[PDB]
Amino acid sequence: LNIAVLLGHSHDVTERELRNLWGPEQATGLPLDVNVVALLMNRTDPKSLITHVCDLMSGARIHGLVFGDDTDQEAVAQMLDFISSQTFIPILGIHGGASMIMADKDPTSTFFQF
Amino acid sequence: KRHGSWKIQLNATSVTHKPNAIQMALSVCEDLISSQVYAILVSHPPTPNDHFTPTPVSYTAGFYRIPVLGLTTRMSIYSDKSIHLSFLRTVPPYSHQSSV
Amino acid sequence: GLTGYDFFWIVPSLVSGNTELIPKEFPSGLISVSYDDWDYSLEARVRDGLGILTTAASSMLEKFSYIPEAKASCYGQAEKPETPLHTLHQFMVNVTWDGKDLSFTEEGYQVHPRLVVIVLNKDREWEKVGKWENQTLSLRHAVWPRYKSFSDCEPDDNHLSIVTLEEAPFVIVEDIDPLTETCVRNTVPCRKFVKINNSTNEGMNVKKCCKGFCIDILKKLSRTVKFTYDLYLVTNGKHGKKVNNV
Amino acid sequence: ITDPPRGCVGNTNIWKTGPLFKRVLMSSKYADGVTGRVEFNEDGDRKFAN
Numbered sequence: 001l002n003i004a005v006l007l008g009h010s011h012d013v014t015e016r017e018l019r020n021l022w023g024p025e026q027a028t029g030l031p032l033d034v035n036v037v038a039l040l041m042n043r044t045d046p047k048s049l050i051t052h053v054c055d056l057m058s059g060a061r062i063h064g065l066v067f068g069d070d071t072d073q074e075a076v077a078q079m080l081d082f083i084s085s086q087t088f089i090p091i092l093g094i095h096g097g098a099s100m101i102m103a104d105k106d107p108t109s110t111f112f113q114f
Numbered sequence: 115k116r117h118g119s120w121k122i123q124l125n126a127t128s129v130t131h132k133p134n135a136i137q138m139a140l141s142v143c144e145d146l147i148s149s150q151v152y153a154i155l156v157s158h159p160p161t162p163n164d165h166f167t168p169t170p171v172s173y174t175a176g177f178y179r180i181p182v183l184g185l186t187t188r189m190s191i192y193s194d195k196s197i198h199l200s201f202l203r204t205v206p207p208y209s210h211q212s213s214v
Numbered sequence: 215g216l217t218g219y220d221f222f223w224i225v226p227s228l229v230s231g232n233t234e235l236i237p238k239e240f241p242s243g244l245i246s247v248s249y250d251d252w253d254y255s256l257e258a259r260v261r262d263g264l265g266i267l268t269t270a271a272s273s274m275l276e277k278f279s280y281i282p283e284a285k286a287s288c289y290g291q292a293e294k295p296e297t298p299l300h301t302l303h304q305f306m307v308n309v310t311w312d313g314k315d316l317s318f319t320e321e322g323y324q325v326h327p328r329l330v331v332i333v334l335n336k337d338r339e340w341e342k343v344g345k346w347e348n349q350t351l352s353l354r355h356a357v358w359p360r361y362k363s364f365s366d367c368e369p370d371d372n373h374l375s376i377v378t379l380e381e382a383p384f385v386i387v388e389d390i391d392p393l394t395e396t397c398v399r400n401t402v403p404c405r406k407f408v409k410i411n412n413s414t415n416e417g418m419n420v421k422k423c424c425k426g427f428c429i430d431i432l433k434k435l436s437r438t439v440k441f442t443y444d445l446y447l448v449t450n451g452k453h454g455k456k457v458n459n460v
Numbered sequence: 461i462t463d464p465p466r467g468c469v470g471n472t473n474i475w476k477t478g479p480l481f482k483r484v485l486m487s488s489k490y491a492d493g494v495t496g497r498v499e500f501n502e503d504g505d506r507k508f509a510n
């Protein structure tokens with residue numbers, strides 16, 4: 001369904017190329033909705049992160065999040081896990097601080113890491 | 115008053131507990147921009163009368179490595195520096211009771 | 215003086231950190247295990263994330279129809295009770311997508327993560343040496359190349375290249391144990407170049423286990439003279455012979 | 461000694477002396493206190509409770 005892919009300046013790839021991943025992403029469309037909303041993120045302030053996540057949540061009701069970061073800040077990972085508990089949004093850490101492994105997550109959080 | 119003749123001043127700012135953890139983190143971050151604080155304290159278990167988790171404050175001030183000094187929470191989730199980067203507390207956690 | 219030619223240091227990805235930043239006092243040949251795979255591009259990672267999310271959505275669709283479980287808003291928890299009725303937590307723990315298994319664990323780890331074994335070569339750069347394939351490890355170098363650690367002095371002299379040959383009472387060669395992939399207490403590792411076939415010149419260094427009278431003599435010699443060796447079997451022919459003055 | 465910056469104005473950085481300030485706090489000791497003697501252990505929790 002409605003899934004958000006949120007990247008920073010990693011490789012400076014625009015959101016259009018992220019939106020291009022609709023055919024290969026479940027070509028045999030089971031929910032016939034699989035719409036991908038791609039946003040660009042300039043800085044990793046926790047206030048900005050929370051605002052972006054929950055505003056995009058209020059916008060078109062995203063059912064997931066694929067978060068990638070270009071900074072070596074592990075705290076971002078934590079700032080996602082906490083959010084996963086407050087929003088019940090499955091979040092997937094891709095690159096940077098988000099992909100840094102986390103020891104213990106609260107059970108009510110659906111955050112997963114690569 | 116009782117810290118010598120040095121002419122440095124200590125100023126105190128405070129924010130109110132809110133039921134929303136998201137609003138708690140947002141208020142703490144706004145507070146940050148609003149005071150250039152040096153440390154943050156969290157000591158209210160019963161005022162929200164809930165899980166009372168100071169986790170939003172700990173995460174927000176550990177993003178900038180600003181030390182947090184909790185005074186009431188005794189859970190062991192705050193005793194590992196990998197998860198909570200800049201957390202300290204004046205009350206030992208429940209896991210210390212084992213020693214007794 | 216604990217970082218010579220013979221000394222080996224293995225560190226996790228925490229020590230190596232950012233690949234581009236290579237500090238001083240890091241000896242060459244430093245072995246690290248990292249996940250920052252250059253072959254794993256950002257687009258591939260986004261594709262895999264979208265795939266796992268969509269597969270979890272399909273797994274939910276198979277069981278129930280109230281799949282669009284979305285929270286009401288960004289604020290107002292005191293005015294809104296929790297509704298954690300159905301979630302995708304329990305479905306994508308077991309999942310296969312695009313012909314590869316991307317299952318997770320109960321703690322948020324990958325069951326088959328794409329690990330990489332990197333080394334710090336003589337150029338002060340991180341090079342890809344090994345890969346985590348399935349649940350085993352694939353190494354590019356069958357025998358370990360030795361790197362100039364200090365890059366300032368102390369060249370290697372106590373490492374010997376030793377050749378030997380299969381003779382019944384003196385050198386006994388046995389195949390490597392499938393269960394352990396390590397030589398038994400009585401044998402020592404010994405490589406042998408085995409050709410792929412007749413016509414081709416390509417081959418691979420099969421690691422066999424070498425024991426016997428001469429091998430025990432060699433072990434005692436290494437113990438006393440205090441050297442190290444990479445024992446291997448000859449392939450050109452027998453012990454020795456001169457043909458056409460060669 | 462640097463200073464803690466803003467929370468939402470182009471500041472992804474951290475307090476350079478943040479680890480230093482945390483180490484200073486963890487190295488602090490007392491002999492008198494309203495709660496009694498206060499000293500933090502290696503993990504940063506209160507040491508010698510009652």
Ligand SMILES: *[C@@H]1O[C@H](CO)[C@@H](O[C@@H]2O[C@H](CO)[C@@H](O)[C@H](O)[C@H]2NC(C)=O)[C@H](O)[C@H]1NC(C)=O
Pocket residue numbers: 125126127128148149
């Ligand atoms: C000392 O702390 C007090 C805490 O109330 C500060 O008062 C607040 O300061 C912020 C930013 O300076 C303002 O946005 C608030 O409106 C103030 N609150 C009130 C009730 O006036 C005070 O400014 C601090 N003194 C400093 C930083 O010199």
Ligand SMILES: *[C@@H]1O[C@H](CO)[C@@H](O)[C@H](O)[C@H]1NC(C)=O
Pocket residue numbers: 042043
């Ligand atoms: C991101 O956007 C904000 C908007 O105010 C801007 O201040 C910042 O410089 C931008 N970052 C870039 C362009 O790297």
Ligand SMILES: *[C@@H]1O[C@H](CO)[C@@H](O)[C@H](O)[C@H]1NC(C)=O
Pocket residue numbers: 308309
């Ligand atoms: C895991 O998923 C596969 C998908 O075909 C299924 O066959 C198998 O029964 C599942 N195992 C479980 C749910 O334990």
Ligand SMILES: *[C@@H]1O[C@H](CO)[C@@H](O)[C@H](O)[C@H]1NC(C)=O
Pocket residue numbers: 313314348
């Ligand atoms: C190696 O991975 C492939 C990927 O599909 C799998 O088919 C194969 O069974 C794996 N090998 C072993 C020994 O499990």
Ligand SMILES: *[C@@H]1O[C@H](CO)[C@@H](O)[C@H](O)[C@H]1NC(C)=O
Pocket residue numbers: 410411412413414
């Ligand atoms: C395969 O290798 C053997 C030697 O091990 C050789 O005798 C045989 O001819 C090869 N098969 C070919 C080249 O088709």
Ligand SMILES: *[C@@H]1O[C@H](CO)[C@@H](O)[C@H](O)[C@H]1NC(C)=O
Pocket residue numbers: 411412
């Ligand atoms: C390779 O080919 C030669 C020439 O025909 C043949 O005599 C020999 O048996 C082959 N070697 C093997 C068996 O690998």
